[PDB]
């Protein structure tokens, strides 16, 4: 899939809210896939850690319902899913293992250049 980031920032169910906030401050990501090794087990967002004690573990806060896409799908399918579900990031998994991630932020900038493009083709 195009517009896929292979350097995914993930967390484990045993990491604490405190360490996740440090990942947010470091990587500027507002959400992370939860993994056991590379196997996707959940998703966590900035909204989930609102008012949560910093010692709380991720596994008790994360959502186990995780929407994902396959590397065989296109960036336009991921854009459609993120627009339909209202989410800002979409993990890309293959055989249950996270192989990448697609952000709504990247595809929103990809739509702009597409409009900037296609005026040279006339």
């Amino acid at each position, epitope marked *: 899939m195009d517009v896929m980031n*292979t*350097e*995914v*920032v993930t967390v*484990t169910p045993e990491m604490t809210v405190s360490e996740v906030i440090d*990942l947010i401050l470091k990587t500027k990501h507002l959400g992370f896939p939860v993994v056991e*090794g*590379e196997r996707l087990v959940g998703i966590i967002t900035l909204h989930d850690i609102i008012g949560v004690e910093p010692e709380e573990r991720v596994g008790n806060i994360m959502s186990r319902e995780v929407v994902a896409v396959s590397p065989n799908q296109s960036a336009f399918e991921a854009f459609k899913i993120m627009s339909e579900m209202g989410i800002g990031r979409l993990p890309v998994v293959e055989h249950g293992r996270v192989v990448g991630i697609v952000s709504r932020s990247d595809l929103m900038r990809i739509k702009e250049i597409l409009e900037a493009l296609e005026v040279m083709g006339w």
Partner: nanobody
Amino acid sequence: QVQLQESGGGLVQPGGSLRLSCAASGSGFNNNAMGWYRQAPGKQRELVAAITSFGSTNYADSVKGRFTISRDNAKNTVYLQMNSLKPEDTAVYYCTAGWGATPRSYWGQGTQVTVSS
């Protein structure tokens, strides 16, 4: 900014032990998460273990328990201790660095580990 240099590795008997080492250099390294990936002869790259600056570990299920990872924060060095090694553990082991439970931003040249009778 960031460079990784593997160390150790070689031929080991089935059920034996082996310790891999990796030192991170460069002014760009700043308590990054460090980990180990491996690639079997005919398979894709695959996570072995990883550890963050906070000390949080993450293991692939196939190596869980048999392998242990630790890191010296002052020396920017990560260690992978392997025990009860199996022939299926034979692969090129790459040292990685980045952020989170699966750091993939920077890579080393890799080191060979062969487990066979």
